[PDB]
Ligand binder design. Sequence first.
Ligand code: CLA
Ligand code: CLA
Ligand code: CLA
Ligand code: CLA
Ligand SMILES: CC(=O)O[C@H]1CC(C)(C)C(=C=C/C(C)=C/C=C/C(C)=C/C=C/C=C(C)/C=C/C=C(\C)C(=O)C[C@@]23O[C@]2(C)C[C@@H](O)CC3(C)C)[C@](C)(O)C1
Ligand code: KC1
Lengths: 173, 173, 169, 196, 214
Amino acid sequence: KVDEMPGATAPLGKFDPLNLATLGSESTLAWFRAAELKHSRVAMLATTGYLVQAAGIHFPGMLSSDVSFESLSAMKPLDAWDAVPEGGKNQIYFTIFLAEFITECKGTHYTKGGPLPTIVFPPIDFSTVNPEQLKTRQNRELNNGRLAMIAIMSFVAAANIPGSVPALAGNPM
Amino acid sequence: KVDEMPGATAPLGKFDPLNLATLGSESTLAWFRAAELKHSRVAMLATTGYLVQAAGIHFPGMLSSDVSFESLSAMKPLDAWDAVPEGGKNQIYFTIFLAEFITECKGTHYTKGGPLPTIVFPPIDFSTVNPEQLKTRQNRELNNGRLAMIAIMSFVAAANIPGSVPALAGNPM
Amino acid sequence: MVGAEGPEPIPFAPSRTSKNFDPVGFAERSPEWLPWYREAELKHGRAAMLATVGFVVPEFVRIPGEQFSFEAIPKVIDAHDALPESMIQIFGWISFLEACTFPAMAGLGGKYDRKPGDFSFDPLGLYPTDPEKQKKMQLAELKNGRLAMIAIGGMVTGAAVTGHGFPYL
Amino acid sequence: SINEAFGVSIETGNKCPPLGARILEDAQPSAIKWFQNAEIKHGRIAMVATIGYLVQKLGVHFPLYLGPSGSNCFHPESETAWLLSSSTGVTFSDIAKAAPLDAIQMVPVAGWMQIFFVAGWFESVAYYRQWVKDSPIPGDYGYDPLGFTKREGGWDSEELTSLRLKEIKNGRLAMMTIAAWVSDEMIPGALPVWHP
Amino acid sequence: AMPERLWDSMVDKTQRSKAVPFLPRAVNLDGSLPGDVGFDPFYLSSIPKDFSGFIQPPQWEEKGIPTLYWMREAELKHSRVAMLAWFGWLATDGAFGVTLRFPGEIYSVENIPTAYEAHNALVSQGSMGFLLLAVGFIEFCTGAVLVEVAKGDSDREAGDFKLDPLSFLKGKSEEEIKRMKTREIANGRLAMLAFGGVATQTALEGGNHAFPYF
Ligand code: CLA
Ligand code: CLA
Ligand code: CLA
Ligand code: CLA
Ligand SMILES: CC(=O)O[C@H]1CC(C)(C)C(=C=C/C(C)=C/C=C/C(C)=C/C=C/C=C(C)/C=C/C=C(\C)C(=O)C[C@@]23O[C@]2(C)C[C@@H](O)CC3(C)C)[C@](C)(O)C1
Ligand code: KC1
């Protein structure tokens, strides 16, 4: 339901001016909920994966046979994506392609009230963690993703339009 | 019940999105069961029977009267099929042809609830083992065959279309 | 004449009217042929309405293809004899539709429940709800068909005489 | 047809359109609804052709990439060119460099069949779910991936009757919208406001 | 013309066919058989002749098959042969990726380049003559049943043989069986016209012999 939902914090509460949670059924809202959950986790890894890849952290050794980690000394972090070879870019997608399956092939899919997407590698046992303090974390998980979804769009717009962002345009990227 | 049986493991559980176990009767599902059991055992022997001799394992002596084991020094393991002579390629099928009979001529066929294909020549009695530990082994047997059914198709596609498989195309075969 | 509609106030140019038009009396002589006559009059009118606009559009449009073109054929009166691979073919498919019509013709009259001309052909849904508009609806098809029967007999005969464009003048 | 045509709202005159009422004010439940199906369907092509022309006139193509080496709105000039056809050698990138009324003919014949087969198959499951199964509601198929139509009320909900009313008008916009856009390329200077 | 017409005992002037709503429904059509929309514009189901006479002559004994029953039995056999023949015609042509051919030189690409010349080439060899005898045995062992049903001594459905080796339908509700049966008919109908297409084009003046035959 709209209420008793993690993601509704103090400074706004229920933030839905254009009434999108009402727009479908209950199964519709569960799709948007784990969308924002997944949009967060991609953007949190891409925002943090932008800040390093820009200060020179630099894995020692060779990435592949001749295209070793010189991708950090000069090119921007928005680049070094075509510099990664095809067989290297391929196993990235396919580990993701596998990870999208256990996400979908649970006993109960989450739009039918089932659980949100969990870890594939190393599950252990999970949020048997004191459900009062569980609700505080899922607010912390989504809000950091909310901030990261804006921030990764800031990082793209700075790399395309110079001067599109004031206290951020004076940064070598 | 598809979930409670040999072959339903942790990361997927009951894996049947297009509902094929429901498609026939209980006799239908028993046919698909021992198909996958037999598809596994052929693919496990063909995947393994491919790796080895691609590395030069090389039976000493002569295969037949003049067509001795030079079939491993040069030709790919997908080849050395027509190099095996006809009388050699004949005994292979007929030992199989004979092995497909005891498989079919049991007191109770398997689609009528009978036992699945048992070892034809050395019939060590297998009735005794703890059936808890037995269920773990038939999950191990099928999953290794599931992986081998994909892998033997990888080995064919690499031998036909170069570059069809990234971290496997740089392999002399 | 009664029930079966069609005679209505349109003055003929000689000093008579079409309020009940049957000069030589086909209604009173052999009235068992009346369902065959209406069914004939319709099929002659339907094919004449289509062939009227069928002469309109092949002046300015010409569907993509080398076999018929202005450079291939300038005079649309000659599309009959110079595209015979399309001529037998249209003839072949009409014979499939005319052949499923036989058993409707074989019980044309009192034996089968249907009125002549009345296919169950309304995909779009435009035949109205009540008699006042329905009889007016069937009447407008009759006159438009009859205006189109006499039309193309003047269009095609005109083009052999004048050899000109579309209003022939 | 009348007030209960459901596509009627405040920014035109009341119940029926003045010029196009008269064909439907006498006809059937079948004719009113069959024209309601077209206007929904003509909108659905126009709601998509609006954006297929937006994306074409920009020039962004399939190696979608947010920044200054691949295809975005800002730099639709990607460095990596993939390959559309593999028998005639036309690529994804050179279609974007042509005019939108010229870029259509660059698609080869393998494409035009497979568009037409999938669209023809969706149009056959179209015809079954509605005219045989008698949905009391037009434009109404089983196509709902996210399940918007399984809520507490169903088809009588105010949010559902809103969106049908919202969809037709956005289709109504888009039909007028793409037609003024096709006009501007065939004759230059046809709609002089903001978009050529 | 003053006898009672033959149009009345076989035309049913009360209802109308689902297919072609302007014609009345043929008397032997129902909704009973699978794949039925009342489609019979030439009223073939209505012919009051015993078509089991072709197998066994009518002078052998009293006997009569329903005309509708013999048609369904034909249409199923026309369906089955055409589903395999269209599939087998393309598969030996390499339309599914692999040029599927029997082992041995005689059935290879060099002696037979495509399926279009396989009938005349195999007929001279004899492999064609052998298959004629092998079908002949089956037909003779399966066409005697038509006689039994025509004598009223059997309750077997048309085209029904106890051929379900994988047990698709054992214990299925009549709704489930009817739907499955409709699939034999609808896919069979499409494949009767598919084979008629492929065999026709491939024999005109142009027309290739590739997977696509246009
Ligand atoms: C063998 C290494 C390995 C592999 C193949 C995976 C695979 C995967 N992880 Mg993962 N993970 C790993 C290690 C690994 N993990 C470890 C050690 C942890 C800490 C417990 C996690 C924690 C974790 C989380 C929190 C999440 C995943 C997720 C995923 C899935 C998608 C992400 C992806 O592409 O990661 C593939 C690439 C990984 C590059 C990087 C990790 C590889 C490490 C560095 C290997 C070295 C660790 C080593 C085994 C430990 C040394 C001791 C050893 C002797 C045992 C995918 C199935 C996501 C998911 O939802 O489903 C899994 C997700 O959210 N992982
Ligand atoms: C072949 C076409 C054809 C047919 C079958 C009919 C059939 C019919 N018309 Mg009709 N009609 C036609 C064309 C046709 N019409 C045309 C072109 C006009 C416009 C002038 C009319 C105008 C007309 C009126 C105004 C009325 C009818 C009516 C009728 C109905 C009763 C009359 C009757 O049975 O005579 C038809 C019987 C025939 C055998 C058809 C006549 C064919 C003749 C024998 C051809 C001889 C040559 C002919 C004079 C053409 C001259 C060209 C040249 C050779 C000199 C009947 C259903 C009446 C009605 O609706 O009744 C309810 C009525 O009031 N008709
Ligand atoms: C082909 C597209 C199409 C179709 C099938 C319909 C169909 C319908 N509209 Mg509709 N409409 C359309 C496009 C279309 N519209 C567009 C583009 C707009 C925006 C201007 C509107 C705005 C509109 C309003 C505001 C309303 C409707 C309504 C209706 C319904 C009753 C009116 C009628 O009989 O149709 C109209 C007649 C036709 C579609 C006949 C075809 C037109 C001829 C053959 C060609 C015309 C082309 C024209 C010359 C191009 C120039 C455009 C012009 C503006 C300059 C009916 C369901 C009403 C409704 O929902 O009633 C319940 C209603 O209130 N329409
Ligand atoms: C209508 C079906 C049909 C027919 C008449 C043929 C006919 C032919 N095929 Mg063919 N084929 C078919 C379907 C068919 N195919 C299908 C469905 C496949 C794919 C699974 C193939 C795969 C195939 C290959 C791979 C090749 C042919 C070849 C040939 C040619 C020589 C074969 C020969 O002489 O018989 C020899 C074969 C037999 C005698 C097999 C036994 C057939 C039995 C007796 C039929 C009766 C069982 C039947 C299934 C019905 C069951 C009973 C019923 C009541 C249910 C000949 C033109 C060859 C050729 O020349 O290629 C160009 C060739 O190499 N076919
Ligand atoms: C060279 C060599 O060695 O081998 C030779 C051997 C040999 C034997 C000599 C050869 C041959 C001869 C062959 C193969 C002959 C095959 C002939 C064949 C198979 C001919 C099918 C016709 C199907 C038709 C006409 C269907 C029409 C369909 C019609 C007319 C309809 O109206 C359909 C339709 O109305 C329905 C029913 C209702 C609607 O729902 C849909 C519509 C309205 C459209 C070959 C091929 O040359 C190869
Ligand atoms: C185009 C296809 C067509 C065929 C193929 C066909 C064939 C037969 N018609 Mg027929 N037919 C029409 C169409 C066709 N008829 C039309 C348009 C009319 C109206 C003009 C028409 C009129 C009559 C009358 C008045 C009688 C009649 C009969 C039979 C009869 C059986 C003969 C027998 O076996 O004895 C056969 C085979 C008679 C009957 O039932 O009793 C003896 C009978 O009086 N028909």
